[PDB]
């Protein structure tokens, strides 16, 4: 009877996992409708099997896991408070309902009863979707999520899901703790460890989506587009990986067109902007008193854009004119094209910006210490080939001979939501 309830709930979870196999996008418009009809049929025959064995909270946590409702399993786990997997399913029920605080309450209760992998993973989730009022509270919740995911790994080093919550957690540390590239390296390492140890981690569309979003932020566009394409193949009905893929593709199309065409600027205006370029637009990079990231006073040489090497050109400073600017919907990287002579145009990616910050066409822009990157992107018959100079913050920009204040810089924030 209880084994019949076990079979009924694993058949219902098999239906919820196999909906996109059996029905797919032709019938996944009726996703919630057909799933709630299946759960009502399972609830009915569930109830007739419960009716013999109503007393058992194992019977009622199986009923609540099938409903994974709130009042049913709340009475169940009031009857048996020790029941950790029922707490996990109940926190997942309020997570689906949107009650993040009550989900955190149930998972914290589950870890106070008995430490286990599911409660560690789910608390490490829900502490990131908890609404915060202050930044130190947000950072404390992120670091606590990293701790719960680490203990989840220490309970199961074979759990690709647990490595996925680690990848999310180190991504949140990267976007909350000053953007150390070691943390993003560890996040992508956790994603690679998940894909190495677990075959069902390959079938999760969320791991590819999050890893591809991190690759998009670190400008690995080809592996990013592979990630959104694989997530769109895994869940075609959920159109947000498709939306992210198409907006990144249209960004690459518009960007490569603007680098090739130099932003539709007529050549007389282009020569006028090149002839208006003066050494006074270097600002504080022209007197030899520039202080680098290591704190040394390094005399900079003005190097042309065409002769630069990939990586950080040490001691070099570049000076150009904006011919086009571009931003996305998501508007973390501000892109603009610079030319210094009649040669090729170079894209500049500016991160950690305020929403109102930008440069105008014709502005003299001087960048000390340029960090080159050669972009070679192939995805679904579309090819892209350009060079982008990545700068991390607008404080390293010299625009019209004037540095910016601290009001132009704001660190890009991470959002985790149901």
């Amino acid at each position: 009877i209880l084994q019949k309830l076990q079979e009924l709930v694993d058949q219902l979870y098999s239906f919820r996992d196999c909906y996109f196999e059996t029905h797919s996008v032709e019938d996944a418009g009726r996703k919630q409708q057909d799933v709630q009809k299946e759960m009502e049929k399972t609830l009915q025959q569930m109830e007739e099997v419960v009716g013999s064995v109503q007393g058992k909270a194992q019977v009622l946590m199986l009923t609540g896991k099938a409903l994974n409702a709130e009042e049913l399993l709340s009475k169940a786990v009031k009857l048996e408070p020790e029941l950790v997997e029922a707490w996990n399913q109940l926190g997942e029920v309020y997570w689906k309902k949107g009650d993040v605080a009550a989900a955190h309450t149930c998972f914290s209760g589950a870890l106070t009863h008995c430490r286990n992998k599911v409660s560690l993973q789910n608390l490490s989730m829900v502490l990131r979707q908890l609404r915060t009022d202050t930044e130190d509270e947000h950072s404390h919740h992120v670091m606590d999520s990293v701790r719960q995911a680490k203990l989840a790994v220490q309970m199961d080093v074979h759990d690709g899901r647990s490595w996925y919550i680690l990848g999310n957690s180190y991504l949140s540390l990267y976007f909350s703790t000053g953007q150390n590239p070691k943390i993003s390296q560890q996040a992508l390492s956790a994603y690679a460890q998940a894909e190495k140890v677990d075959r069902k981690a390959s079938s999760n569309p969320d791991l590819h989506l999050n890893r591809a979003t991190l690759h998009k932020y670190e400008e690995s566009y080809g592996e990013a587009l592979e990630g959104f394409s694989r997530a769109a193949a895994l869940d075609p009905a959920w159109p947000e990986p498709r939306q992210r893929e198409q907006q990144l593709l249209e960004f690459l199309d518009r960007l490569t067109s603007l680098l090739e065409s130099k932003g539709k600027v007529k050549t007389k205006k282009l020569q006028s902007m090149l002839g208006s370029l003066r050494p006074a637009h270097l600002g504080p990079c022209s007197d030899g008193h520039y202080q680098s990231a290591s704190g040394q006073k390094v005399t900079l040489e003005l190097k042309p854009l065409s002769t630069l090497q990939p990586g950080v050109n040490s001691g070099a400073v570049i000076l150009g004119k904006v011919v086009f600017s571009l931003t996305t919907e998501e508007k973390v990287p501000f892109t603009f094209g610079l030319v210094d002579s009649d040669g090729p145009c170079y894209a500049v990616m500016v991160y950690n910006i305020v929403q109102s910050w930008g440069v105008l066409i014709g502005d003299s822009v001087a960048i000390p210490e340029p960090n080159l990157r050669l972009h070679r992107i192939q995805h679904k018959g579309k090819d892209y080939s350009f060079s982008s100079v990545r700068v991390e913050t607008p404080l390293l920009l010299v625009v019209n001979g004037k540095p910016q204040g601290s009001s132009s810089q704001a660190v890009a924030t991470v959002a985790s939501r149901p």
């Binding site: 976007f175 947000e240 910006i353 924030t413 985790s416």
Partner: peptide
Amino acid sequence: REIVHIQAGQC
């Protein structure tokens, strides 16, 4: 299942 977005800062 959870989704992650990364937006630019406001202040």
